[PDB]
Design a protein around this nucleic acid. Structure first.
Ligand SMILES: [Zn+2]
Ligand SMILES: [Zn+2]
Lengths: 49, 147, 65, 604, 98, 595, 26, 98, 18, 49
RNA sequence: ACGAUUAGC
RNA sequence: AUCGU
């Protein structure tokens, strides 16, 4: 059904639409936090061994 | 109004129905061309006022370009496999030549070129003004396809 | 209380393996058993849905981590 | 047990025990027909109640003051009620009524309003006018029930005598406490017992077709007749919906507090957002699970094309991010002596942290526990309170921004710095697109729109005939035929041959009044305009229809829940997309000739 | 810095897209419809069906093959962009095999 | 203001408030609301704000996309972004801005930001409706003046309305049914002699019944269609047990009936008062004060006055006269009472006479009519019901669920409330506004007051089915007032086209019951009711290519049974028609040639 | 093989409803 | 969920309804391909979250192998002589490449 | 009892139903 | 009856009905071979002894 | 001389 | 809203 039936808005511009939809996501920045946990996980396994 | 006051031509409100009531069809079929056209081409005699406005627009083509309305074109794109879209194409093809729009012929070509894409394809100039654009969006004199 | 009442009703309405089968194990009215069989068929059809088979409302101890 | 003895087969018939036939139904109907109210109250007394059904009753419901100190006579020789709490204390006082009763014949223990006071008010006495106004208003308040309440009470008793019912699908009996746990019904019995006293009659009042009779007793007040209906409603809802006892007890406490106050209707209007604001407005402070519909409604918007795509689990981050509703709720609970109920509701609400069925049912019970009665007040007071407020315009349109008058209309120049320019532009484009659009000239359309307001219903024809005869123009009259002479069809028949020039005088006529009550809301006054006055306002409604049909996203929905935009609410209430409720207070007096009509008439 | 896709990606040189049939998904749909039509037209299968039902099936297949769906175009030239945007910031980085 | 509760309190009052009860009030209110919200969102908003995030929010939403207004109230939708839901502080600041903006031109917006939605007194939380029970009182009724209450049949109608309101609000179904039956019995008797309504009349009014003829208790749901369809549904559900019960006790007849067999259903139904109740339920429940004697030539000048008022433009009168001319030429009384513009004055006169107090003689006539109907004996049912009973159905497999069983869609419906929960889960709620969907079915959008669009469309469809020349439809449309060219075109369109089941159903007086309108009935009417039997063509359920409108009637005949039974809605297959499709169509046509 | 049952019904113990015939009861 | 929130494409099954309502077929036939496919093409449990999840499964093929459920296939083999099974085969063949 | 299917008629004797 | 206890061959007599339901034929015809064959076979349950 | 007067949808 | 008083 999804393949057979799907349409775009009647009047859209792709770059404007994506620039609207992407901005909120980028500000959140929880990507940075994980890296820190990965570092401490590696340090923990090495100090364990 | 001045045209309507003195013009001998008039309504004859029964020709369309009389020439469709005698079409031989089968009641078993679901689709019926006569009942489709009689519902797609409803007369209300505001049609004559619109016709006289279009006819009087001939005198002023330097200030007025009597283009055809967008609602007449099929919503989204038509399909030749659709009886309603085919009758809409017929109505558009008959109506277009009476306008003063310089780009009437290209719109007349594209109103049919649009509704049968994939089924039947022709080359285009660019990928922005492709084969599946709205036929009314060809108003500029040099948007006419090279094909 | 209403919480356990709802839980009991849901369990009663809903609740009713890999091994080869063995020999050991016209005028239709409306009847309670006749309604029950349709209810069982309906609930089995719902339960055999691939998304429902894995859908959960609360995360476990490791998905949250 | 007398209910069982006199109704044995009927309960077994309607409880799924035995077959349901016609003879049992007719015998039970005859027994219902011949059943005295005192017998109903005796059967009520036979109920072996339990604890958890008993809530203390204040002693101050019975002992109430008189009515003289609540009304007065102002200038212009008008009767109205003086206010003690703001400008909304214009409802029925909770004062006693006993001293206004004269015993009716054929039965000593009941009476009605005395004809002596009625005559003394008719010929011009002040205190008599106050007394008769109070008596008639109390009569109107007591006359807000479909049928005698004892019939509903007895029907509930008969229905609930059957006990628990088996469920064919769930394959078990339904666990709902019996009548021994019905708090409102026990309160009803206690109130009736205390009012009746030594007198053999037990009904506090009897409801006839036109007028009701009051059982005179020193403990009788004017707050009883709405209280009884309220308790019966609560008991029926508890029995037929499985309401938990605690919420119903809180509702009964609120009702008794309202009765013990100065005015029942005023108090219940002041406290009408206790349950919806403590429960509905404060759940899901911390979520851990649940399912919500993943609605998505398509880009074609004016057609309301909604699509449903499964259900998605609730994340923890979809909690209640709205500002807390604690301060005003606590302040309101402290102001009206309802702190315990508010505290109980707030403490109970926080215990639901998952969006399962139970939380929704608790919300439904809480919203059901509010008191639903038809508030009533004197028409001369709703007229004086609703039609005297005027809008407060802080930045009006500057005087220099207008032009000369086109008759009685001044066009607003588009060079204005005021915000009305955009409204004028929108209405101007709407009017132009109407006028050019051609269906507004077919004679059938005009006939339909001219026959829209011609309805078999009153339209203030007396004022029409008075105003039209003020210019010595005579209209035909019809006598001897049984048609109503106070309807708009009569006006249309009277205004057939007359041209517009003669009937244009009646446009400025004085409209008559109208009134209708409403549940938990002040009654609304309605002014029906005569037939030419409906006629003269056709372009306004037509261009408004054009605006609402093409320019904006709106609906003109119907009266019942079935004919309504339910999907839109389901979409707007989903957790990912929160919504805002915008309401306009007193929109009737909002638009006037200063700003809105002044712009709109010129634009049209 | 590389993410794989089961379907091929052809970027779009325009920002105002509109319906066109040049891509693998539409080709697949059209070929399935044509194969069904050829199966219906098989000499061992056509006599088993009535005259009108064959025409109805042919028309249904033609309309299904000529339907106006933008999902193939999206999957070709907009889905990879969104996937590549979302992929970096994600509590579990993509773990893929060829 | 000339009230009655306070003597000597008549006066006049000048007010500046816009009139309520006028034609234009709600429309202009909604229009102004939308326009002011739009201008706020466009020009006033950004001119009085400082924060960047609130400006970003305000530039994102417009009234054409997310704002719905009806009159006084309104609702605004804020959609979620990729990073969850919009921050609350920005919304609070924007609401403060709205409050500041509204007071400039004399408006006080009552704005609530609570995480829920309110619109037209409907409450939703997390995509789940919540019925406000207290807003619909059970014993309450509003009365402004001191007029006396209407007679007993009016309170019967009020009790039926109470039951329907309880249905819509989602109560405990078993207990609510029992209490509704209790009230039914309580209010069923009134003296004058005594008058009683046999239970079966109340069943015909739409109240479901618990356990009869020794069947299983609690077997019928309240989704029962009201009216004739409803009787057919439950009778066809329980027929093979009804015949057994009848035969088991003294009801045997040598004659064999195609519906009931060798059971004397006539004598049994007459003794059970089922015919008496069924026929009495159809009698009017208000005094027939309409038609009261009037001196002549006075009613005549009255009707002439309304006729002159209605038709001031000569051309419309010419259209009506033409329509009558070709109606006499072609109609020839094929349909008994074709609607026309000349009969509008008569209907207006009847309606104006109706709104009046009825004398004692009118009530006496009403009671005499009820007594005569009760005392009489009836040989058989109505033609429509007998035609319906000729159709047999079969129920093989239940539908697959259309809604997840763990998703709360509405309050009150849950596993504790088995019937509504299973019905909604199996069928599904209606995700489209009923108003537009019902509007798209009508041939003519609106007509003059005093006439019914349903009546006009029913007359048009009867003139199609009963064979009639196209000219008859043109004459009818001219009599309605349509222009000659448009009438001809519309008649030509109507002659050959096919229409959905609802309109065809109207041909025999069938409409979707108000109870079903909360569920997604259209998909069931289209797909999950199959006219072809599960084992191929039976050569007996052969609908001719003429009278192809029978399919809609069969669709409701099946759907009533599919929806009446408790539990999961089940796919239903047509099984047999006794007399044959052409015979049943002939029965419908010979009923159409009536009324 | 169609065996309808008539007369001499009684009550059920699981649910106290009264049935038409003993075979319907069981 | 992130894909559904970011993507401009939205699923609308009314296109299929219109393009199948515009089909030409006779009433006297005992089975109709248009009605058959329209009835078949309604997903069980009315959920459409099996497409965005299918797209999201591209990122993880090392651990997750998204396969078509058993119930999608016909209950007992099939038969090209049966239109319902033929439509089921169409659905399966058009959905497998994702 | 024994009941006919096409028309609901209960015949007491097991043999006359045929 | 002894062989019945051993044989794993179970009948679902609805096979013929299911395979005969989807047979293309016009309603206007008056012979209906599918109905004829179904009425001739009369699929029962005890017709296996 | 007084009296059973009302919206729109 | 005059025959009800
Ligand atoms: Zn039992
Ligand atoms: Zn027989």
């Amino acid at each position: 059904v999804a393949l057979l039936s799907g349409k775009y808005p009647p009047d859209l511009v792709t770059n404007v639409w994506y620039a609207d939809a992407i901005y909120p996501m980028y500000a959140d920045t929880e990507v940075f936090s994980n890296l820190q946990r990965d570092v401490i996980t590696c340090e923990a396994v090495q100090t364990l061994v | 109004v001045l045209l309507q006051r003195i013009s001998p031509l008039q309504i004859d409100p029964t020709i369309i129905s009389n020439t469709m009531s005698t079409v031989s069809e089968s009641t078993t079929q679901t689709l019926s061309p006569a009942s489709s056209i009689l519902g797609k081409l409803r007369p209300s005699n505001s049609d004559f006022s619109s016709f006289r406005v279009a006819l009087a627009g001939w005198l002023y083509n330097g200030v007025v370009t009597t283009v055809i309305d967008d609602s007449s074109y099929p919503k989204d794109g038509g399909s030749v496999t659709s009886l309603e879209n085919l009758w809409d194409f017929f109505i558009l093809a008959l109506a277009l030549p009476l306008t003063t729009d310089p780009c009437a012929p290209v719109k007349a070509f594209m109103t049919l070129a649009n509704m049968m894409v994939g089924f039947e394809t022709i080359p285009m100039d660019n990928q922005i003004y492709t084969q599946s654009r709205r036929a009314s969006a060809f108003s500029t004199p040099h948007t006419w396809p090279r094909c | 209380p209403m919480s356990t009442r709802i839980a009991e009703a849901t369990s009663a309405i809903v609740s009713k393996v890999g091994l080869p089968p063995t020999a050991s194990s016209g005028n239709m009215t409306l009847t309670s058993s006749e309604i029950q069989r349709h209810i069982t068929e309906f609930i089995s059809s719902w339960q055999n849905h691939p998304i429902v088979q894995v859908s959960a409302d609360v995360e476990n101890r490791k998905t949250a981590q | 047990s007398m209910i069982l003895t006199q109704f044995g087969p009927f309960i077994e018939s309607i409880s799924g025990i035995t077959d349901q036939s016609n003879d049992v139904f007719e015998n039970a109907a005859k027994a219902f027909s011949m059943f005295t109210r005192s017998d109903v109250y005796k059967a009520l007394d036979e109920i072996p109640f339990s604890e958890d059904a008993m809530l203390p009753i204040p002693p101050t419901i019975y002992t109430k003051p008189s009515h003289d100190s609540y009304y007065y006579i102002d200038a212009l020789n008008r009767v109205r009620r003086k206010t003690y709490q703001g400008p909304d204390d214009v409802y029925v006082p909770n004062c006693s009524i006993v001293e206004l009763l004269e015993p009716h014949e054929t039965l000593t223990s009941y009476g009605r309003l005395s004809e002596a006071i009625e005559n003394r008010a008719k010929d011009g006495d002040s205190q008599a006018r106050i007394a008769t106004t109070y008596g008639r208003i109390a009569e109107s308040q007591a006359r807000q029930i479909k049928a005698p309440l004892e019939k509903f009470v007895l029907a509930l008793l008969v229905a609930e005598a059957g006990g628990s019912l088996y469920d064919p699908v769930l394959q078990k009996y339904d666990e709902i406490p019996g009548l021994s746990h019905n708090c409102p019904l026990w309160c009803f019995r206690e109130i009736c017992r205390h009012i009746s006293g030594p007198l053999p009659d037990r009904a506090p009042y009897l409801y006839l077709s036109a007028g009701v009779f009051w059982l005179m007793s020193p403990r009788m007040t004017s707050a009883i007749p709405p209280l009884l209906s309220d308790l019966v409603n609560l008991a029926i809802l508890q029995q037929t919906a499985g309401l938990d006892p605690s919420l119903v007890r809180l509702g009964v406490q609120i009702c008794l507090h309202a009765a013990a106050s100065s005015s029942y209707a005023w108090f219940i209007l002041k406290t009408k957002s206790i349950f919806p604001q403590n429960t509905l407005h404060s759940m899901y402070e911390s979520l851990e699970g649940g399912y919500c519909p993943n609605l998505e409604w398509l880009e074609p918007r004016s057609d309301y094309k909604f699509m449903y795509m499964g259900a998605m689990p609730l994340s923890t981050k979809y909690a209640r991010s709205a500002p807390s509703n604690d301060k005003k709720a606590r302040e309101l609970g402290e102001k009206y002596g309802l702190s315990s109920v508010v505290s109980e509701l707030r403490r109970r609400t926080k215990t639901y942290s998952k969006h399962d069925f139970t939380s929704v049912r608790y919300i439904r019970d809480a919203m059901a526990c509010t008191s639903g009665i038809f508030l009533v007040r004197t028409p001369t007071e709703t007229v004086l309170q609703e039609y005297t407020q005027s809008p407060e315009i802080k930045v009006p349109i500057p005087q220099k921004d207008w032009t000369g008058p086109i008759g009685e209309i001044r066009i607003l120049k588009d060079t204005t710095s005021s915000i009305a320019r955009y409204l004028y532009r929108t209405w101007y484009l709407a009017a132009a697109r109407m006028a050019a659009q051609p269906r507004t000239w077919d004679p059938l359309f005009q006939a339909i729109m001219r026959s829209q307001y011609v309805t078999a219903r009153g339209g203030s024809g007396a004022t029409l005939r008075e105003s039209l005869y003020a210019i010595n123009v005579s209209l035909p009259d019809f006598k001897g035929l049984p048609v109503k002479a106070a309807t708009k069809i009569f006006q249309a028949a009277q205004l057939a041959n007359l041209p517009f020039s003669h009937t244009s005088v009646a446009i400025l006529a004085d409209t008559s009044m109208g009134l209708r009550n409403q549940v938990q809301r002040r009654p609304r006054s309605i002014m029906p305009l005569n037939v030419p006055q409906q006629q003269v306002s056709a372009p306004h409604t037509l261009t408004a229809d054009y605006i609402n049909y093409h320019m904006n996203l709106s609906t003109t929905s119907g009266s019942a829940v079935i004919e309504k935009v339910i999907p839109l609410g389901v979409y707007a209430s989903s957790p990912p997309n929160q919504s805002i409720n915008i309401d306009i207070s007193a929109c009737d007096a909002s638009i006037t000739w200063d700003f809105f009509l002044s712009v709109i008439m010129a634009a049209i | 810095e590389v993410l794989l896709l089961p379907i091929d990606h052809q970027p779009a040189n325009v920002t105002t897209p509109t319906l066109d049939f040049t891509n693998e998904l539409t080709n697949w749909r059209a070929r399935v419809c044509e194969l069904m039509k050829n199966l219906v037209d098989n000499q061992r299968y056509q006599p088993g069906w009535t005259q009108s039902l064959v025409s109805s099936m042919r028309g249904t297949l033609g309309k299904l093959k000529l339907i106006k769906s933008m999902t193939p175009m999206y999957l070709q030239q907009l889905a990879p962009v969104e996937l590549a945007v979302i992929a970096p910031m994600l509590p579990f980085p993509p773990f893929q095999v060829p | 203001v000339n009230d009655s509760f306070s003597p000597g309190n008549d006066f006049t009052h000048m007010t500046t408030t816009f009139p309520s009860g006028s034609t234009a009030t709600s429309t202009e209110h909604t229009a102004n609301n939308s326009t002011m919200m739009e201008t706020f969102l466009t020009v006033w908003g950004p001119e009085h704000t400082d924060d960047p995030d609130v400006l970003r929010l305000m530039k994102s939403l417009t009234i054409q996309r997310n704002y719905v207004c009806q009159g006084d109230d309104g609702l605004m939708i804020i959609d979620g972004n990729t990073a969850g839901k919009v921050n609350s502080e920005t919304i609070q600041k924007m609401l403060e801005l709205i409050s500041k903006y509204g007071e400039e031109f004399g408006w006080k917006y009552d704005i609530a930001y609570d995480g829920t939605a309110e619109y037209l007194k409907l409450y939703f939380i997390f995509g789940c409706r919540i019925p406000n029970l207290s807003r619909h009182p059970i014993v309450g009724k509003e009365r402004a003046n001191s007029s006396a209450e209407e007679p007993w049949p009016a309170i019967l109608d009020q009790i039926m309305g109470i039951f329907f309101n309880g249905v819509h609000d989602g109560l405990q179904w078993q207990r609510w049914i029992r209490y509704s039956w209790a009230l039914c019995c309580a209010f069923s008797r009134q003296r004058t002699g005594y008058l009683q309504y046999p239970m079966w009349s109340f069943v015909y009014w739409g109240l479901p019944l618990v356990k009869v003829f020794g069947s299983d208790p609690w077997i019928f749901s309240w989704y029962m269609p009201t009216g004739d369809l409803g009787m057919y549904s439950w009778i066809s559900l329980i027929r093979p047990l009804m015949t057994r019960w009848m035969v088991a006790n003294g009801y045997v007849t040598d004659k064999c009936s195609p519906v009931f067999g060798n059971a004397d259903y006539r004598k049994c139904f007459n003794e059970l008062k089922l015919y008496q109740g069924y026929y009495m339920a159809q009698l009017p429940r208000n005094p027939k004060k309409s038609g009261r004697a009037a001196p002549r030539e006075v009613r005549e000048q009255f009707t002439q006055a309304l006729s002159d008022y209605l038709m001031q433009n000569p051309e419309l009168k010419s259209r009506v006269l033409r329509g009558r001319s070709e109606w006499e030429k072609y109609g020839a009384g094929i349909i008994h009472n074709p609607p026309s513009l000349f009969d509008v004055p008569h209907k207006w006169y009847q309606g104006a006479q109706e709104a009046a107090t009825a004398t004692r003689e009118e009530l006496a006539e009403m009671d005499e009519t009820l007594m005569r109907a009760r005392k009489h004996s009836y040989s058989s049912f109505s033609k429509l019901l007998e035609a319906y009973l000729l159709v047999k159905w079969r129920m093989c497999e239940a539908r697959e669920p259309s809604v997840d069983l763990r998703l709360p869609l509405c309050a009150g419906i849950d596993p504790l409330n088995s019937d509504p929960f299973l019905k909604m889960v199996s069928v599904g709620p209606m995700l489209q506004s009923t108003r537009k969907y019902f509007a798209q079915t009508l041939f003519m959008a609106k007509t003059v007051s005093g006439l019914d669009v349903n009546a006009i469309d029913s007359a048009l469809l009867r003139l199609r089915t009963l064979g009639a020349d196209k000219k008859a439809l043109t004459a009818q449309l001219l009599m309605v007032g349509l222009q000659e060219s448009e009438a001809d075109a519309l008649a030509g369109k109507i002659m050959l086209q096919d229409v959905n089941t609802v309109q065809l159903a109207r041909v025999v007086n069938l409409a979707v019951p108000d109870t079903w309108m909360s569920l997604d009935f259209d998909t069931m009417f289209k797909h999950h009711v199959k006219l072809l039997p599960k084992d191929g063509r039976h050569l007996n359920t052969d609908i001719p290519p003429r009278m192809g409108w029978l399919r809609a009637i069969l669709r409701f005949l099946g759907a009533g049974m599919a929806m009446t039974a408790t539990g999961v809605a089940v796919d239903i297959y047509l099984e047999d028609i006794h007399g044959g499709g052409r015979s049943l169509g002939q029965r419908f046509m010979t009923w159409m040639r009536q009324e | 093989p169609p065996t309808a049952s008539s007369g001499h019904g009684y009550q059920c113990h699981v649910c106290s409803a009264v049935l038409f015939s003993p075979l319907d009861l069981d």
